[PDB]
Symmetry: none
Subunit: 123 residues, 2 copies
C-alpha cells in the first residue's frame, strides 16, 4: 500500500475509471450506488451491488493488487444490469460500453500492468 | 454462398469465435449446447439456449449480415448464464470474458467489417 508500485497501479486503475469509464455517454446511473429512493426494489433483487464509486473507493484503499479482481468488479456492474434491467435494456448496453472501454484499455496497458503486478508481488 | 463479401464477413466472424472466444480459459462448457445429462433442469429454466457451436453453424450458413445480429446471439449466451448461474458465478465470469474479447476483436476489425457490411447491404 505504501509501496509506490501499488500506488502507481491503483493510480492507473483510477484513471481508467475517471478518464474512460465515467466518460461513457449516459453512464451517470452507474457512477454511484443505486439510490433506493428511485429504484425501490434494487437491493431486494441484486444480492451483490456494484458501481463505479465503490470501485474507486476500493482503488483508493489499494484493494486491487492485480487487474483480474478489478475487472471482476467492473464485470459485476454489467451482470447485475443484465439481471435487473434485462439483457436487452438500454442500461445494459451502456454498462457493456463501460465494460468495453475498461477491458480494451486494460489490453492496451498489458505490458505496463504486468510489470507493476510483478513488482507488487515481489514487494 | 457465392457472394464473396458475405463469405469474407462470415469467415472473419468465425475466426473471432475460434481464435479468441473459444480460446478463453475454461470456456469449453460454452462451446456446445448444454448437455441436459449433466445439467438436468437447464432447458426448463432457459427458453432460448445459445452456445458457440450454434453461432458457428449460423456463421457457416451466412445467417449474419451485420455485427448486430451476431452480437445479439453472443450476448444471449451471457444472458442465459446470468439467469441460470447468477451474476457472480464463475461460469458467468467466463461468459463475460467470451463476450468482452468478442467486442474487443470486433473493434479491432472495425474497418474491415464496416466495409463488408456496406457491400453486403448494397447487394
Amino acid at each position: 500500500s505504501m509501496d509506490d508500485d501499488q500506488v502507481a497501479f491503483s493510480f492507473i486503475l483510477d484513471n481508467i475509471v475517471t478518464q474512460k469509464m465515467m466518460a461513457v455517454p449516459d453512464s451517470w446511473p452507474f457512477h454511484h450506488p443505486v439510490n433506493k429512493k428511485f429504484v425501490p426494489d434494487y437491493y431486494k433483487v441484486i444480492v451483490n451491488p456494484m458501481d463505479l464509486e465503490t470501485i474507486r473507493k476500493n482503488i483508493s484503499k489499494h484493494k486491487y493488487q492485480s487487474r483480474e479482481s478489478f475487472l471482476d468488479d467492473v464485470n459485476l456492474i454489467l451482470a447485475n444490469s443484465v439481471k435487473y434491467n434485462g439483457p436487452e435494456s438500454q442500461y445494459t448496453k451502456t454498462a457493456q460500453e463501460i465494460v468495453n472501454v475498461c477491458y480494451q484499455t486494460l489490453t492496451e496497458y498489458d505490458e505496463h500492468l504486468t510489470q507493476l503486478e510483478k513488482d507488487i508481488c515481489t514487494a
